[PDB]
Amino acid sequence: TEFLKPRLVDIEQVSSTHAKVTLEPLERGFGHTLGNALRRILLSSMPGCAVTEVEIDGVLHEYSTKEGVQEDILEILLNLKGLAVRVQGKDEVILTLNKSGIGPVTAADITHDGDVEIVKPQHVICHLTDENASISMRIKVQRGRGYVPASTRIHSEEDERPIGRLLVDACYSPVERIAYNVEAARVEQRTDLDKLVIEMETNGTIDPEEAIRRAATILAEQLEAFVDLR
Amino acid sequence: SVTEFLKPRLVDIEQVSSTHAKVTLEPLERGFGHTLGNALRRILLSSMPGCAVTEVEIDGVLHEYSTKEGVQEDILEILLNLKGLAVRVQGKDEVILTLNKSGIGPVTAADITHDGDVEIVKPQHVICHLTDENASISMRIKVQRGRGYVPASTRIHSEEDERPIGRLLVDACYSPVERIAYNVEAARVEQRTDLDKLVIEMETNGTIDPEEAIRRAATILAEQLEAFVD
Amino acid sequence: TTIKAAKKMVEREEAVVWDILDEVIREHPVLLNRAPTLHRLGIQAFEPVLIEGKAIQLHPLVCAAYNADFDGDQMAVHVPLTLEAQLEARALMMSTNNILSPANGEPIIVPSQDVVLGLYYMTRDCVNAKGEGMVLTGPKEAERLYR
Amino acid sequence: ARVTVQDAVEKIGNRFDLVLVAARRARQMQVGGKDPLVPEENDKTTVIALREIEEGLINNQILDVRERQEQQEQEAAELQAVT
Amino acid sequence: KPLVGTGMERAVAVDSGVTAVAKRGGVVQYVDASRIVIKVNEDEMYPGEAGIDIYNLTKYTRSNQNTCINQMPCVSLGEPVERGDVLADGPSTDLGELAL
Amino acid sequence: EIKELLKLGDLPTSGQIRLYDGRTGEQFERPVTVGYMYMLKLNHLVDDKM
RNA sequence: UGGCGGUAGCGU
Ligand SMILES: [Mg+2]
């Protein structure tokens, strides 16, 4: 019956995170199926980068407090978990952050090698209440997929663990909200063709077109096994 | 390993009957089984091309709530039996067949006038029964190539047939699939026992091989997703 | 080679020990019971299956047999070893054999709660629901139309 | 591959001697080194014994008759060997 | 914070000793995750007194049920405070409100 | 008062919305009740009970 | 790699 082939028409980048993509033309049945499949794949298997291991200058353990900062080390780890970062080229990145004086220490103060890009410099990391107090930390950024609990990372005991190397759970998923709403489309004179509109809310570490292409490639690779069968 | 994804390597096929099949596939990534099964079920059920009966005209019959002498089956039963008939057509989309029979006994699918393009999968399929030797039966069946399921209420007036005498509309079951179900069980790989195993039980009308239908659906989805590969 | 090596392998948690465990549990029933065992059906055996998590997954229908709501109740599990005990597990400890109550003869397993509710929603009939007046040839076409 | 033994107790009866005969048969497979007559589709002794009970090949009577036959034949072989 | 409450969570938190209720009003001089320094106002120093109140928080102390007992400051540097106001919340408390 | 507050927030006044299943992508036949509820964590952990 | 009583609390 010569099924038509959907195409990515346009991308609406309203903000740095919120995005809208449009796929058309689409037949009646394929719209909801593609929307649901793309939503699930994007929500689950989208790769990303996250901070896992940190090292403070003078903190023996993450159940402690440091003079000069009004937030506990656990709060520092929780704030570090929400950091958004893109690597563009390697799997392991080490960042050093050093700050002195009273004020809100944010992600912009983190030194960048140049290859690594910070998406949200306005993200506050901590607060230095005393001028003499200084904060120096080293954070590790790794590329991964899905959620990796700290206990699973602990299972790697080949190198033991130096005292002071705090472990933070990794949330590699760069997307937080996915929705779709297929609607009528006006192509040629056929009234059956439909356009699928996908609204995504990410952390700004991935492009919408790249994410859609990766999800489609993953789905095609999965269906390659179906095609051959026995 | 971000691009790497698990693939089913233990494809298992069980042939309960010539039209009933059970396919077990594992291992699959967490959450992939559900979306794959849903997409395959929707595509198989609603978006498969196939040839099916659309309408039929019977001499001496003007409405659904009518009756004819010599046949113990009601006109509604005749329409349902015609719905149950499966025809494979290759020459062209729309074909007119003529069935004329008189006597006593079951009038089955073997009594239809046979053309080269048309094919009857089940000759033993009994269309009706003639209880009177003097009574005769004569239908002109219309078979068309379409997609999915088209209820008669959809084309009750959108067809704009303008009410030819005796043209009773019947439901068109274009999709060869008769019933498809998919379940997801737990599966273990090494220490990970959270993997998904997909079990698909599906039946066809006998026109095509069940695994052939599955391959056709997979190819349809892959060709739909051609514009976003790589 | 020796029991000490097997102990070390078990505490090291290889994959071969998991495969051996999977082979062992294949048809070895285990007895589950509640702390306030009042009537005869208080203790029953099951064919266990390996699952993740840290809690014992229990069959929903047999819960009414145990009189144990999933609000924090704790099950106790025992493992038979000898062949006679295993055959007792497969013959009399089994829940499948326990279908009629020993007090009045009524069935002990009975669908309840969401299950029956679902069936209710599957049997109530409207008047102007979509598809009224249609004529189908079998339940397969009904499932096709519904899905 | 066995969830209900109703067709087995109906074959044997009384639901008690079935356990004893199945235990004897399972011990014969496990420590006695006997050959399971019915096919073994990756199962251990107890369910092979139960399925053999189901098929009717083994019950109490055939079991002790075979045991007596084995005892007498091995006794005859031993007395032939010593003589 | 509980979205739906009955209004006495403030009273329960204040009456309970998990919070660090200031004894004399003033202006915060040195805030930290461990100590709080309060510079009391002109009306409220006793004669011959520094007028500096030092509140020492309890960080990660064992409870009678093997549960964490942590205190986190809620005020900011330079924020004026009055007697009876909360300065550092304890366990299950957010801005001087019970949060179970 | 609850209905007026819901009207102020532009949410439906009935308190029930139309949820879409994420497992299959279908639509639930009847509206369901959703909303923000306060939930606690009892001191009855599972790791110290097994 | 040592458990015997008592006290208080928790779930049916
Ligand atoms: Mg209870």
Coordinates of N, CA, C and O in Angstrom, one line a residue, chain D residues 3-82:
Chain D
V3 N 2.6 -30.6 39.0 CA 2.0 -29.6 39.9 C 0.8 -30.2 40.7 O 0.5 -29.8 41.8
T4 N 0.1 -31.2 40.1 CA -1.0 -31.9 40.7 C -0.8 -33.4 40.7 O -0.5 -34.0 39.6
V5 N -0.9 -34.1 41.8 CA -0.7 -35.5 41.9 C -2.1 -36.2 42.1 O -2.1 -37.4 42.6
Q6 N -3.2 -35.6 41.7 CA -4.5 -36.3 41.9 C -4.6 -37.5 41.1 O -5.0 -38.6 41.5
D7 N -4.1 -37.5 39.8 CA -4.1 -38.7 39.0 C -3.1 -39.7 39.5 O -3.2 -40.9 39.0
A8 N -2.2 -39.4 40.4 CA -1.3 -40.3 40.9 C -1.9 -41.0 42.2 O -1.8 -42.2 42.3
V9 N -2.5 -40.3 43.1 CA -3.2 -40.9 44.2 C -4.4 -41.7 43.7 O -4.7 -42.7 44.3
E10 N -5.1 -41.3 42.7 CA -6.1 -42.1 42.1 C -5.6 -43.4 41.6 O -6.3 -44.4 41.7
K11 N -4.3 -43.4 41.1 CA -3.7 -44.7 40.6 C -3.3 -45.5 41.8 O -3.5 -46.8 41.8
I12 N -2.7 -45.0 42.9 CA -2.3 -45.7 44.0 C -3.3 -45.9 45.1 O -3.7 -47.0 45.5
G13 N -3.9 -44.8 45.6 CA -4.9 -44.8 46.6 C -4.3 -44.5 48.0 O -3.2 -44.8 48.3
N14 N -5.2 -44.0 48.8 CA -5.0 -43.8 50.2 C -3.9 -42.7 50.5 O -3.8 -42.2 51.6
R15 N -3.3 -42.2 49.4 CA -2.4 -41.0 49.5 C -1.3 -41.1 50.5 O -0.5 -40.2 50.6
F16 N -1.1 -42.3 51.1 CA 0.0 -42.5 52.0 C 1.0 -43.5 51.5 O 2.2 -43.1 51.5
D17 N 0.6 -44.7 51.2 CA 1.6 -45.6 50.6 C 2.2 -45.1 49.3 O 3.3 -45.6 48.9
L18 N 1.6 -44.2 48.6 CA 2.2 -43.6 47.5 C 3.5 -42.8 47.8 O 4.5 -42.9 47.1
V19 N 3.4 -42.1 49.0 CA 4.6 -41.4 49.4 C 5.8 -42.4 49.7 O 6.9 -42.2 49.3
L20 N 5.4 -43.5 50.4 CA 6.5 -44.5 50.7 C 7.1 -45.2 49.5 O 8.3 -45.3 49.4
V21 N 6.2 -45.6 48.5 CA 6.7 -46.2 47.3 C 7.5 -45.2 46.5 O 8.5 -45.6 45.9
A22 N 7.1 -44.0 46.4 CA 7.8 -43.0 45.7 C 9.2 -42.7 46.3 O 10.2 -42.5 45.6
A23 N 9.2 -42.7 47.7 CA 10.5 -42.5 48.4 C 11.4 -43.7 48.1 O 12.6 -43.5 47.9
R24 N 10.9 -44.9 48.1 CA 11.7 -46.1 47.8 C 12.3 -46.0 46.4 O 13.5 -46.2 46.1
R25 N 11.4 -45.6 45.4 CA 11.9 -45.5 44.0 C 12.9 -44.4 43.9 O 13.9 -44.5 43.1
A26 N 12.7 -43.2 44.5 CA 13.7 -42.1 44.4 C 15.0 -42.5 45.1 O 16.1 -42.2 44.5
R27 N 15.0 -43.3 46.2 CA 16.2 -43.8 46.7 C 16.9 -44.7 45.8 O 18.1 -44.8 45.7
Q28 N 16.1 -45.6 45.1 CA 16.7 -46.5 44.1 C 17.4 -45.7 43.0 O 18.5 -46.1 42.6
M29 N 16.8 -44.6 42.5 CA 17.5 -43.8 41.5 C 18.7 -43.1 42.0 O 19.7 -43.1 41.4
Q30 N 18.6 -42.6 43.3 CA 19.7 -41.7 43.7 C 20.9 -42.5 44.3 O 22.0 -42.4 43.7
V31 N 20.7 -43.3 45.3 CA 21.8 -44.0 45.9 C 21.9 -45.4 45.3 O 23.0 -46.0 45.3
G32 N 20.8 -46.0 44.9 CA 20.8 -47.3 44.4 C 21.4 -47.5 42.9 O 21.6 -48.6 42.5
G33 N 21.5 -46.3 42.3 CA 22.1 -46.4 40.9 C 21.2 -47.1 39.9 O 21.7 -47.8 39.0
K34 N 19.9 -46.9 40.0 CA 18.9 -47.5 39.1 C 18.7 -46.6 37.8 O 19.0 -45.4 37.9
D35 N 18.1 -47.2 36.8 CA 17.9 -46.5 35.5 C 16.4 -46.0 35.5 O 15.5 -46.8 35.5
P36 N 16.2 -44.7 35.4 CA 14.8 -44.2 35.2 C 14.2 -44.7 33.9 O 14.7 -44.4 32.9
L37 N 13.1 -45.5 34.0 CA 12.5 -46.0 32.8 C 11.9 -45.0 32.0 O 12.0 -45.0 30.7
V38 N 11.2 -44.0 32.6 CA 10.6 -42.9 31.8 C 11.7 -41.9 31.5 O 12.7 -41.9 32.1
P39 N 11.5 -41.1 30.4 CA 12.5 -40.2 30.0 C 12.8 -39.1 31.1 O 11.9 -38.7 31.8
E40 N 14.0 -38.7 31.2 CA 14.5 -37.7 32.2 C 14.7 -36.4 31.5 O 15.8 -36.2 30.9
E41 N 13.8 -35.5 31.5 CA 13.9 -34.2 30.9 C 14.5 -33.1 31.9 O 13.8 -32.1 32.2
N42 N 15.7 -33.4 32.4 CA 16.4 -32.5 33.3 C 15.5 -32.3 34.6 O 14.9 -31.3 34.9
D43 N 15.3 -33.5 35.3 CA 14.6 -33.5 36.6 C 15.3 -34.4 37.5 O 16.1 -35.3 37.1
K44 N 15.1 -34.2 38.8 CA 15.7 -35.1 39.8 C 14.8 -36.2 40.2 O 13.7 -36.3 39.7
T45 N 15.2 -37.0 41.2 CA 14.7 -38.4 41.4 C 13.2 -38.3 41.8 O 12.4 -39.2 41.3
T46 N 12.8 -37.4 42.6 CA 11.4 -37.5 43.2 C 10.3 -37.4 42.1 O 9.3 -38.1 42.2
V47 N 10.5 -36.5 41.2 CA 9.5 -36.3 40.1 C 9.5 -37.4 39.1 O 8.5 -37.8 38.5
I48 N 10.7 -38.0 38.9 CA 10.7 -39.2 38.0 C 10.0 -40.3 38.7 O 9.2 -41.1 38.1
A49 N 10.1 -40.5 40.0 CA 9.4 -41.5 40.7 C 7.9 -41.2 40.7 O 7.1 -42.1 40.5
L50 N 7.5 -40.0 40.8 CA 6.1 -39.6 40.8 C 5.5 -39.9 39.4 O 4.4 -40.4 39.3
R51 N 6.2 -39.5 38.3 CA 5.8 -39.8 37.0 C 5.7 -41.3 36.7 O 4.8 -41.7 36.0
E52 N 6.7 -42.1 37.2 CA 6.6 -43.5 37.0 C 5.4 -44.1 37.7 O 4.7 -45.0 37.2
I53 N 5.0 -43.5 38.9 CA 3.8 -43.9 39.6 C 2.6 -43.6 38.7 O 1.7 -44.4 38.6
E54 N 2.6 -42.4 38.1 CA 1.5 -41.9 37.2 C 1.3 -42.9 36.1 O 0.2 -43.2 35.7
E55 N 2.4 -43.3 35.4 CA 2.3 -44.1 34.2 C 1.9 -45.5 34.6 O 1.6 -46.3 33.7
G56 N 1.9 -45.9 35.8 CA 1.5 -47.2 36.3 C 2.6 -48.3 36.1 O 2.3 -49.5 36.5
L57 N 3.7 -48.0 35.6 CA 4.8 -49.0 35.5 C 5.3 -49.5 36.8 O 5.5 -50.7 37.0
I58 N 5.4 -48.6 37.8 CA 5.8 -48.9 39.2 C 4.7 -48.7 40.1 O 4.0 -47.7 40.1
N59 N 4.5 -49.7 41.0 CA 3.7 -49.5 42.2 C 4.4 -50.4 43.3 O 5.5 -50.8 43.2
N60 N 3.7 -50.6 44.4 CA 4.3 -51.4 45.5 C 4.5 -52.8 45.0 O 5.6 -53.4 45.3
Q61 N 3.5 -53.4 44.3 CA 3.6 -54.8 43.9 C 4.8 -55.1 43.0 O 5.6 -56.0 43.2
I62 N 4.9 -54.3 41.9 CA 6.0 -54.5 40.9 C 7.3 -54.2 41.6 O 8.3 -54.9 41.4
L63 N 7.3 -53.2 42.5 CA 8.6 -52.9 43.2 C 9.1 -54.0 44.0 O 10.3 -54.4 43.9
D64 N 8.3 -54.6 44.9 CA 8.8 -55.7 45.8 C 9.0 -57.0 45.0 O 9.9 -57.8 45.3
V65 N 8.2 -57.2 43.9 CA 8.5 -58.3 43.0 C 9.8 -58.2 42.4 O 10.6 -59.2 42.3
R66 N 10.1 -57.0 41.8 CA 11.5 -56.8 41.2 C 12.6 -56.9 42.3 O 13.6 -57.4 42.0
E67 N 12.3 -56.4 43.5 CA 13.3 -56.5 44.5 C 13.6 -58.0 44.9 O 14.8 -58.4 45.0
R68 N 12.6 -58.8 45.0 CA 12.7 -60.2 45.3 C 13.5 -60.9 44.1 O 14.3 -61.8 44.4
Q69 N 13.1 -60.6 42.9 CA 13.8 -61.2 41.7 C 15.3 -60.8 41.7 O 16.1 -61.7 41.5
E70 N 15.6 -59.6 42.0 CA 17.0 -59.1 42.1 C 17.7 -59.9 43.2 O 18.9 -60.3 43.0
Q71 N 17.1 -60.0 44.4 CA 17.7 -60.7 45.5 C 18.0 -62.1 45.1 O 19.1 -62.6 45.4
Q72 N 17.0 -62.8 44.5 CA 17.2 -64.2 44.2 C 18.3 -64.4 43.1 O 19.1 -65.3 43.2
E73 N 18.3 -63.6 42.1 CA 19.2 -63.7 41.0 C 20.6 -63.4 41.5 O 21.6 -64.1 41.2
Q74 N 20.8 -62.4 42.4 CA 22.1 -62.1 42.9 C 22.6 -63.2 43.9 O 23.8 -63.5 43.9
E75 N 21.7 -63.8 44.7 CA 22.0 -64.9 45.5 C 22.5 -66.1 44.7 O 23.5 -66.8 45.0
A76 N 21.8 -66.4 43.6 CA 22.2 -67.5 42.7 C 23.6 -67.2 42.1 O 24.4 -68.1 42.0
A77 N 23.8 -66.0 41.6 CA 25.1 -65.6 41.1 C 26.2 -65.8 42.1 O 27.3 -66.3 41.8
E78 N 25.9 -65.3 43.3 CA 27.0 -65.5 44.4 C 27.3 -66.9 44.7 O 28.4 -67.3 44.8
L79 N 26.2 -67.8 44.8 CA 26.5 -69.2 45.1 C 27.2 -69.9 44.0 O 28.0 -70.8 44.2
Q80 N 26.9 -69.5 42.7 CA 27.7 -70.0 41.6 C 29.1 -69.5 41.6 O 30.0 -70.3 41.3
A81 N 29.4 -68.3 42.0 CA 30.7 -67.8 42.1 C 31.5 -68.5 43.2 O 32.7 -68.9 42.9
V82 N 31.0 -68.7 44.4 CA 31.7 -69.4 45.4 C 31.8 -70.9 45.1 O 32.7 -71.5 45.8

